[PDB]
Amino acid sequence: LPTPHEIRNHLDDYVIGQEQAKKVLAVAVYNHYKRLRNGDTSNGVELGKSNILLIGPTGSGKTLLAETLARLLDVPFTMADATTLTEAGYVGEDVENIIQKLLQKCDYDVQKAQRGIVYIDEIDKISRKSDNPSITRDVSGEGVQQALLKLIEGTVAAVPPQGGRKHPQQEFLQVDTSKILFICGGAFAGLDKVISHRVETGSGIGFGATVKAKSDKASEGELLAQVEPEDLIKFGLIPEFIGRLPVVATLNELSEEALIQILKEPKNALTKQYQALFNLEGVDLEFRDEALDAIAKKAMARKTGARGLRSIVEAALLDTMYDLPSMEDVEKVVIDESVIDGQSEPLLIY
Amino acid sequence: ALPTPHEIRNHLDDYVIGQEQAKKVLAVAVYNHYKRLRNGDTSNGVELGKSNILLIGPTGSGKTLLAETLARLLDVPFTMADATTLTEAGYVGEDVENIIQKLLQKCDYDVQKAQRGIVYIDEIDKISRKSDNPSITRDVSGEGVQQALLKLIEGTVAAVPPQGGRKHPQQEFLQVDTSKILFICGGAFAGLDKVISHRVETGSGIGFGATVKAKSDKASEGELLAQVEPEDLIKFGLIPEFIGRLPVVATLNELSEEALIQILKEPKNALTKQYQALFNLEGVDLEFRDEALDAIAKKAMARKTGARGLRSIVEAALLDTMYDLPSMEDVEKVVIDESVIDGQSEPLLIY
Amino acid sequence: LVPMVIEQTSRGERSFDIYSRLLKERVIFLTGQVEDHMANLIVAQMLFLEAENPEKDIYLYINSPGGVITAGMSIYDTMQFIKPDVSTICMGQAASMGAFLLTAGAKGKRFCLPNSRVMIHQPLGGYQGQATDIEIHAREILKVKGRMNELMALHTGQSLEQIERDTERDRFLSAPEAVEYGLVDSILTHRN
Amino acid sequence: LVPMVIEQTSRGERSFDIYSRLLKERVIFLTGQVEDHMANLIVAQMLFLEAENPEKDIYLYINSPGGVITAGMSIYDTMQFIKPDVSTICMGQAASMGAFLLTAGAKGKRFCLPNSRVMIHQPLGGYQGQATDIEIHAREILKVKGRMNELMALHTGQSLEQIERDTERDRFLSAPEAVEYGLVDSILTHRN
C-alpha cells in the first residue's frame, strides 16, 4: 500500500548513503503487497514472488534498514538470527518457532500474521560445511536451510495459541507462509574472493598490455553487484534457496561524505552522545568541521563501517577524558583535525 | 560520589606496574559506565552507547590481573568468563547465554542490576579462526562462538533460568537486555606480531637494497602490537563483525627488566612478600639484596614467561634452603644475594 | 655450474637456481659484453616484474665492459617505459654502455660500490666500402654520439658541452668522482 | 661430472649436487681464473646467505691463480658490505687476487692449509694506441696499484712502504710466512 517514494523517504531519514539499496527494497515490498490484493493473480501468468537478500559489508546499515522499516509498516515485524537456529530436536533451537514469534506480535491472529514480514539476520553464518569427525553431527548448516526453505515454498505452520499448555488439545493454528515476506540479510565475508576469481581478467606482461596495480585492482564495492548463483553455492548456500530469492539488494561501503553526515546529522549521532556525556560533567564539547573529515578518513581505513568512528573518537579523547575530571578551571574543550592526527592535544579553554 | 579515573588508576597502580595505557582505558571506561548508571537515559534526548575494550597483551603482562583488581573496587556486579568453555548453540560444550547467568548470580538474580553490569572474557584469542578463510568444517569452538557473541555484545534479551530452572512452565527464563553490559575481551594473541610485521615491514629481499635486521634490530612484540589495526586481526582469525563490536583496542607492553624489579617489591602482593610471609610464620626472616632482585629479573626475561618467570628463579634458588630449613634449628634470618642467584654460593644463614 | 637453492613456501619446498631465486626478489644481473640476446633476456625480466608488482622497485646489477649500442637502447627504453623505478648498482666496473645504463637509473636510486671503476667514452664503429656509403654511416654514428651525449647530460645533470669534452677520449671515474659528476647518487659502503 | 648426494630432512629425502649441498652450509667455492661471470655467481651466493642468516659466518675456499681486478673488487666489496664475517681459507694456492681476497677476510677468521702457496704481485695491463690514450690508461693502472696496496696494508697490517717494495715483483709466501706477514691468521693442520 505505501508508495515507494514514501518508503524511501522514511528510510533516508535514518539511513545515509544507501540510496540505491533503498530503491530496491521499496519497490520489492510495494510490489509484494500489490500481489496480495489481487486474487488468483488476475491473469494466466503467475507473478514472481518477492524475496529480498540484503547482502552487504559490516556496518553498512543492513540491520538498521530492517529495524527502521518496521516502524513505517503497520504489519507485524519479527527479527530472527540464523546463528541461533538449529535442526529440529536439538538443544539449540527450532526454525518453526519463527512463525510463532511473529504471531506473538499480533496476538496469534492468522490474518495479520500472513501479512507480516520476517528478517533472518546473519544468514551467511549457516552456510553448508563439510563433515567433521570429532563433531557428532552438523546441526547448523544445510539442515537449517531446508526448514527455512520449506516456509518459502509455502506451507501452513501449526502454532499453539495463547501459550497453550503441554496438553496438545488440537489447536494447531495454521498460518500460510506463501504470503509472508521473507528477507534474509547477512554479511557474506569472503564472497569477494570467489567472485573476483571469476570476473578478474588478469594482468598482461607485454608493452601493449594493461598493468593493474594493487591500488586500483578491485574492491568489494562494484564486485558484489555481479554476484551470481554459482558463487553463492560455493559459499555453502543451497541452490534451491538462492533460486527462491530473486531480488538481491547489495549494499556498498560507506563513503567519506556519508560517514561525515552520520557523525552529526542523526539525532543519536556519535558526536551528540559524547556532547551529552561531557554536559553531564559540566563541560560542553565542540567538533570542528575539518575534524569530521579526518575521522571519516581514519574510519574508512579500519573497514568496520560506522563502528569505526567510535574507535577514532575514543582514542583521540582518551587522554583528556582521563584527566578532565581531575582538572579544574576547564569550562570548554574543542577538538580539530590536528587532534585527530594525534600530533596535537585537545584544545582547552580557560 | 563518582570516582575519577585517576582514583581508579591509583588502585590499579598498586597491583599493576607498567601498564599505564591499560589503566587509562579501563579507568575511563569505568568512569563512563558509572555516569550512565548514575544518570539513566531519561532526560538526555540522545541515548549513550557503550564502547567495548579489547585487552591485547603478551603472557604475564597483567591482563588477567587487571580484571581481578578491578572487581575489588567495582561497585557494579562483575564476573569473569572463559572463552574456551563457550561453544555455539546446538552443541554439548556450552552456550554464550551462560555468561549472563553467571553475572545474575552475583547480583542474586536481579535483572535491573544485571543489565547494567561489566563482564570480562579472558582467552578471547583461543576462539580465533586459523586463517582469514571462514572454515573448512563446522567449528564448534571458533568462529561459531564469535557469531553467537555478536548479538550478546551489541545487545539482545538473554534467556536465563530465574531460580533453579525447574518446576517452571517453559523454564520461566528471565529476559535481560545486554545492550548496556560493557564487555572487556582480554587475550594473548600469540603470532599476531608476524602478521603486523608483514605489512609494517617491507623490502625483505636478498640484494643490496634489501633490509636485514639479524633478529636483534627487529621490532619487538610490544612495539608491533602497538601498531595493530583491524585488518591485521582479520588475517589472525578474528571475525570482521566481532572486531566492529570492540572499537577500543588496548595494547599492553612487555615487562622490561626494570619493571620486573619493581614488581618484586612494589606491588601489594609481590613475589618477595609471598615468600617472606612463608618464612615469618615459621620463625625466620627472609632478606633479598637489591642486586639479587636485578639478577632474578635478567633470568626471568630469558624464560619468555614474563612475570611468571620470576617465580621459577626464586624457587630454584631457595629449593635446597627450603628443604633443610624446617629440620634445622638456630635459624633466625636468611639473606639472599646476587651470588645465590648465579649459583656460586649458598645463601647466608644467621645463627 | 650454477648452484641450486631451496626456498620455503606455504605450498612446500621449492628449488630454484641462484639467478632465478634473486629474480623473484626483483634483481636482474647485467653481466658481460652487451649484445642482442642478453639484452632481450633482460627486457623480458623487466616486463615480467612490472606485471607482478608495478609499484615495487626493480634492481639492476651492472658489471660489464660495454657492448653494442642498439642492444643497450632496448634496455634503456624499457627502463624509462615501465612504471617501476629501476635502481642501478655498479659492481666491479661500468664501461660506456654499462655507465649509460647505470646513470639512466631512477634519480636517487643509483648506487656504486666503493672500489668500482666507471669509464665513459664516445661511440666507436667502422665501415668499409664506397665513399657514398661512408658518408651515410659516418653521419649515422655522429647522430648516435649526439643522442647519447644529450641523454647523459640529462641524467648526470652536467652541461652538454662538458659531456662532449669529457667523452671525447676515455675518462675513468672512481666511485666518489662519479657522485660528483652525477653518474651515481651515493655509495654503499656497509650494511646499515 | 658432479656427484649428487642425498640429504635427510624432516620433510623427506632430497637430492643435491655436491656444490649446492655445501652452499646450504654457508660454503662458497672460488676456483679458477677470476672473471666477471664467476664473480657475479659468488656475489649472488653471498647475498643469498646473508638473507638466510646474517649472523652466521660464511666460508670462502680459495684455490685460484688470479684474474681480472674489477671482477675481484666486486667480491671484495660484497664481503665487506654484508654483515656476516667471511672466513677465507686457502687451498692449494692463492695468487694476487686470490691473496687479496684471502687477506680481505674477517680478522681472526683467515686460514691457510700447511702446504698452500700464496703469491702477491703488482697489477698487469697493457694498451695499444695514441700516446694520449696510453697516458690515460697508464694513470689508471697506477691508481689501481696504489689502491690495492693501501687495502693490503690495512688487512695485513704492514706499512704501505713495505707493501710497495714486496709487491714490485712476484713474491711467494708459504703458509707460515703468510702468518707473519699478516695475510692469514692461523694454519689448519689437523682437526682438533
Ligand SMILES: Nc1ncnc2c1ncn2[C@@H]1O[C@H](COP(=O)(O)OP(=O)(O)OP(O)(O)=S)[C@@H](O)[C@H]1O
Ligand atoms: N547507513 C547508515 N546510516 C546511519 N548509521 C548507520 C548506517 N550503517 C550503520 N550505521 C550505524 O551502525 C550501527 C550498526 O549498523 P548495522 O545495520 O548493524 O550494520 P550491519 O551491516 O548490519 O553490521 P552487521 O554486523 O553485518 S549485522 C547502527 O545502529 C548505526 O548506528
Ligand SMILES: Nc1ncnc2c1ncn2[C@@H]1O[C@H](COP(=O)(O)OP(=O)(O)OP(O)(O)=S)[C@@H](O)[C@H]1O
Ligand atoms: N604488571 C604486573 N605487575 C605485577 N605483577 C604482574 C604483572 N603482570 C603479571 N604479574 C604477575 O603475573 C601473574 C599472572 O599475570 P596475568 O594477568 O595472569 O598475565 P596474563 O596477561 O593473564 O597472561 P595469560 O594469562 O597467559 S593471557 C599475576 O598474578 C602477577 O603475580
Ligand SMILES: [Mg+2]
Ligand atoms: Mg590471562
